[PDB]
Ligand binder design. Structure first.
Ligand SMILES: [Zn+2]
Ligand SMILES: [Zn+2]
Ligand SMILES: [Zn+2]
Ligand SMILES: [Zn+2]
Lengths: 201, 199, 202, 199
DNA sequence: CGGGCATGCCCG
DNA sequence: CGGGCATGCCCG
DNA sequence: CGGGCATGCCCG
DNA sequence: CGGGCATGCCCG
């Protein structure tokens, strides 16, 4: 209905929260998050796990929506899709049941549904919200990205921003958080450099 | 003829603002607080944030119209220099009037209006409430000739007036700010603020 | 069926075709100036620009001479040379109208000046008949007129152009051809002097 | 037939030549005599000078065929990567199959060829006599992908094989040269020669 | 008729 | 995202 | 317009 | 596992 995904955090009634645990001081590390720059550094198609949390059990049939947007205004109008070279390829499109075009995928959850909103044209994947696990503090949705931040054709070196939403069976918004995403060949280097430049300021 | 470039918040405190875009010679867009100056780059995306605390006239809408500052010119209309109006540069691909100066980018309900006997050009969008969690409705504008175009604004400054209205024309509010469309806002902003300050 | 990329290459034919330029103002704001060092004229939009034609032997009746512009740089070579959309319609010189304002090159005076618009190549030019040099005159003088400032947007913007003069037969042929960089601007002298210096640095 | 190559001047000595280019490192194109390698930026106009000794036959023409160098990749046909193919940028007029690497501009008589089952793509154009008072027949080519393109030439050196031939299949003109498509050609060129001199 | 500037654009 | 030139045009 | 950086991936 | 490299692109 709306073509400019709201970017602003807003926990809402319940206190929707997104956090990343595992850390890896390496360069070719599948994934690693930078708290100082609220930016996730993930590799191509590598298992990326984020952890959701809330204070009170949300309404029945709630959802978790993950959708990509561009950080800059000049680009934000353009739908974030998978580049031709990675779309038409066999690798990962061979019997996966997820639209070749989709950038973000959800790993290990049949209940996950990929969405192409017909008017907006935006793409996003959803899963029913889950109560953590009995002995855990958070809910672990584990995501995937199928294009580097620099894929000529798709992203094209443009910075994105993954937005995680706590939704109603109908769409009404109960929560939201966001952060910058940069898919690389190796997040060790990329992250350090960006935090060293931040330190350089 | 000659809309009222006169400020008026109205009933619902109307606040159109700008974010913190960086200062850089060739920055796509930048805004000055000392002056009400929007330094803009041709055809680039310029995000302008509109805040409204109590919004409730469904069918209400927001207009953006361009006007000349100096009085002798304010009676003249703000069109595009025939060079860009005729050129193939930004005119194909879009579904917006060849001659208007202002264009909305992230919206398709937009209305480019050519006043029948007024001759003023402006573009209206519907007022959409800010999305749950944030405070301002964000409209995306881009200007299609540089302020210095011969055949158009022959270097004469222009003011932009954003009016929120009732489905049937009735100005609930309005605001203004001078805008400049140049190759590099950063170097132009730096200079403008300097000369005015000195005096 | 025509030639796609008019060659600029000079051609002194059986007749000895030459294109000379008389003494010109070194004056900064000059109406027109020339450069044999940089072999390029510098003329003002819509100002009378003289040109000296010369030949050892005289050619047959019906023989005329063609002036056509073409971009100097290859990545621009294919674009035809027309006037900026602005000037082509601009009411400031289509009045006292005579020829299509598409055309950049016009001819002053001569009423035998018929323009061309090659349907095939969509190429624009202009042609007048070869009158033998005025009695006691070495040169057959044709006035060419240029309409857009080499820096006009929409039109040839800041993209150098070449002006090919062609000693052409009565019907489709080439007997002689000489070329030379054209540069339309506001300060012909300020420009030429700035150009030649820049050259006297290499 | 498939991977030809060996030069062959022929009846009318076929000579492929390049004019003097821009010394600049990021120029549209440059040719390296010592390295018999053409360096040009993607989609930029590359002029090539074709010459012959005697008025070649009647309805004869010229064709450009690109082939991978390494004796390994010869098998593989050389086309545009998926991205530059299904991408807007240069297919919005396309009197040229979006798949072809080599393209000709200016000429309307260009014909793009796809071999039957052993399909190789190429561009041909009727040969034309040098315009009166010139010795060079000039053809303006375009190279739609970068030799670095992942999914395309994927950094695989290639040869453009120019051949003069007669409609009746008789190929009696064969001149070939190395071709590299890249962002700034001067740089790679000087880098290519610098080291080969030393190594 | 030359000096000088503003602002687009390309390059020490 | 900074330094410096282009080149139409105004000044006087 | 050249010098420097960005960024997938080669190499050991 | 990281350091260094080529190659497209942006900063000054
Ligand atoms: Zn991709
Ligand atoms: Zn304009
Ligand atoms: Zn013009
Ligand atoms: Zn490619």
């Amino acid at each position: 209905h709306e073509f400019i995904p709201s970017n602003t955090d807003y926990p809402g009634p319940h206190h929707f929260e997104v956090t990343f645990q595992q850390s890896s001081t390496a360069k070719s590390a599948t994934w690693t998050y930078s708290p100082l720059l609220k930016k996730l550094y993930c590799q191509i198609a590598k298992t990326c796990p984020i952890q959701i949390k809330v204070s009170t059990p949300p309404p029945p049939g709630t959802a978790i929506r993950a959708m990509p947007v561009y950080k800059k205004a000049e680009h934000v109008t353009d739908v974030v899709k998978r580049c031709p070279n990675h779309e038409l390829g066999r690798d990962f499109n061979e019997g996966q049941s997820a639209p070749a075009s989709h950038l973000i995928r959800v790993e290990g959850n049949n209940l996950s549904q990929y969405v192409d909103d017909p008017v907006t044209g935006r793409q996003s994947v959803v899963v029913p919200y889950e109560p953590p696990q009995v002995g855990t503090e958070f809910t672990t949705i584990l995501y995937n990205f199928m294009c580097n931040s620099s894929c000529v054709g798709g992203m094209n070196r443009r910075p994105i921003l993954i937005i995680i939403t706590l939704e109603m069976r109908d769409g009404q918004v109960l929560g939201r958080r966001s952060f910058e995403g940069r898919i690389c060949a190796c997040p060790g280097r990329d992250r350090k450099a960006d935090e060293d430049h931040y330190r350089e300021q």
